[PDB]
């Protein structure tokens, strides 16, 4: 090695004397450097296959072949650099499997890497980008980091070096070292936040929380524990577990009020978070009481259900119907509470029951004698009853709209996930959600929560 | 023009002149002029920001800056390439924003690119990798393609050429052109299958179908259309849209029967597919008839609901309870039918009603007068009635087991998403689902389907 450092200087001074650079490199330097790499590869801390781009200088590639020490060696060369395959054979002693590519045909690099990984799918593979055009090297690296998703044993490698002489177009002999170029997730920790943020923006709150919690496990940065709490709060809220959501939100607000978290980015949104936690509190209170005097909790629950129905409208129509039916039922029951009455025991007088059978018969296209009122008012019975009692919000419904909704309202309990086998049309679910929305805006005006959305607050990064 | 200039340059070099100084004197002014007049840029592109690595080759970075035409220009240089910043300012005429990095510090590339995208989050940004070490260029490309996931307007760019003279270490003048380097996702069609197969493996059937549809177009290969149908069938099945699931499964089976597709990989799992489609057909039949003599459809619907309940139990227990209650209800009604009683309105004599009130009281630990029998039997009422009528499966349950189930069973209709406000424990869902599973295993033996799983068949690639 100090032999190598001494003859490097001998070479340098011979070049300053007028000796040719390439010739004296081949004669004085390269045999000793090559012998060193044969005996002892300068390799950072397993490869079964190595794949090497090949440009106009074969020496870097010879070193990378010896450093990876793979049994199977592929060489991605161009029509122009094919001339160097004999030298590669004689310097490495390896069988070469050559693949010709254009020097900036990045797609072909991608395709050849695909083909090779499919040929060697479960062994460690080194992708050496040292030699070639920037297009070849960058294409090989890009292909490697892309395919690690599906071929995790792939590694991108590089003959790093120290004293690159721009005149000599070579580094100082003996400073070369083969090493692994890390992928961005491996290299830069904060990029995990990006994955978490993406999942959060998709409504995948449980996975987002898992990512944030794993980041605290990786780096110890407790700022991401607060983000995990937030994602956990939304996970629980979207799953209708208002107790767990309230607990997570209260923990989060408590943490954000500590001096150490004063500049956490979620504090830029504190009021929004406080309002959402107030909503969760109100819903928790209403769920415990089951009493429709608690207007804020009725609003919070119906708002949550209508938002869930809107999100399920495309991918989950059966659930969308269920959410929309429950929201409308809650809102109609709150209207009945405006009259002091309860749907499970409305206390209909004989005159009221007769009038209700007549109105239901007109809506259902039957005779009043065919209408049988259950002990607990069904959804359509409740709507008809409120109209009979002069409810101002339901009185505004046209007869055409109500006739259009009558089939869907009548079949509330006949839904597949309640007691029957039916799925109403998406158009009817749309009409049920529209009716519910109008009742919700009436209630929203009468509640201390004001208008509030379940949409998540922006993360602030 | 530039052709004749390049021949004059090569001639002056042949005559012993200094290649680099002669490039600076004879070639570089004409090329720089040309890139100021009309830069050679492959379809013309508009960038707001450009980011440039800088090695020992400032000419390439000047061409890249002028080609990108960005208002804001960042230069990622090393301590060794810093001395080139003044000349790069003169050639381009731009205010440069320099950022220092080590020549192999790939983490530093990732960090600085991340900072710059955060500073310019919504504008098109060019990452020029032409000049620098291979670690710098490959790091910039890898950073670009990685961050495209989160910053879609990022592009990786490169000053390519038609010919490069390896002795002069220069592109042939006037053959340089600024090119976008494609990311491996957009350059390789076939990779979409791997993504689909990943999504399919995680049960994301809609996205898997979407990727399969994409592949059909980008390749010539209608084979992927079959995969798309399979994914659509599972999507519809999980969403409880049995009609659409059956439509897709029948279309798929009919295509797998054509001569062209006899070697399709799905035909390796043909038997399983056929069985799943028959289950779907039986469920579709049962949903139209709503009659518990159709044992196969009862089995298929209860099996589907129990699978969904098991999937939802841990993180969506409200929904899991809804699914598990429906599954258990169906199975108990089928067992009422099997006893020869009407499964939707068993006609209890006053003597049977009295006996059932006594049995429920002894069970619930209350007095008989505190038990009220609704017009529709609840789950607990129905289970106790089946036990009174000598049902053997249910007769095997112990008193301890029944009292452990009694709370959950009484809460069928008081579930939040039915008529009430209950938010259940995953433990209560587990009890309901385990009772249902036992009844399902009993019905399995009495059905022409036999045992079948809603678990997706392997793709076979």
Numbering used by the authors:
A (entry chain B): 1 to 45, 49 to 464
B (entry chain A): 3 to 44, 46 to 464
Verbatim from the authors:
Type III CRISPR systems are innate immune systems found in bacteria and archaea, which produce cyclic oligoadenylate (cOA) second messengers in response to viral infections. In these systems, Csm6 proteins serve as ancillary nucleases that degrade single-stranded RNA (ssRNA) upon activation by cOA. In addition, Csm6 proteins also possess cOA-degrading activity as an intrinsic off-switch to avoid degradation of host RNA and DNA that would eventually lead to cell dormancy or cell death. The two TtCsm6 monomers dimerize in an X-shape, and each monomer contains an N-terminal CARF domain, an intermediate helix-turn-helix (HTH) domain and a C-terminal HEPN domain.
In this study, we initially determined the crystal structure of TtCsm6 in complex with cA4 in its post-cleavage state, uncovering the mechanism of how TtCsm6 recognizes and cleaves cA4. The overall structure is similar to that of apo-TtCsm6, with a root-mean-square deviation (RMSD) value of 1.0 Å. Compared to the apo form, the CARF domain bound by A2 > P undergoes a significant movement in the mobile loop spanning residues from 165 to 179, which encloses the two A2 > P molecules into the catalytic pocket of CARF domain. The two A2 > P molecules bind to a composite site across the TtCsm6 dimer interface. The adenine group of A1/A1ˊ accepts two hydrogen bonds from residues T81 and E83, while their 2ˊ, 3ˊ-cyclic phosphate is stabilized by residues T59, K137 and R172. On the other hand, the adenine group of A2/A2ˊ is specifically recognized by R173 and E179 from the mobile loop, while the 2ˊ-OH group is stabilized by N164. Upon cA4 binding, the primary conformational change occurs in the CARF domain, where a mobile loop along with the two helices situated above the catalytic center switch from an open to a closed conformation, completely enclosing the cA4 molecule within the catalytic center. It is worth noting that while the CARF domain bound by A2 > P also displays a closed conformation compared to the apo form, it is noticeably distinct from the conformation observed in the cA4-bound state. On the contrary, these interactions were not observed in the A2 > P-bound structure, where the HTH domain adopts a conformation similar to that of the apo state. On the contrary, the conformation of HEPN domain including the R-X4-6-H motif in the A2 > P-bound state is essentially identical to that of the apo state.
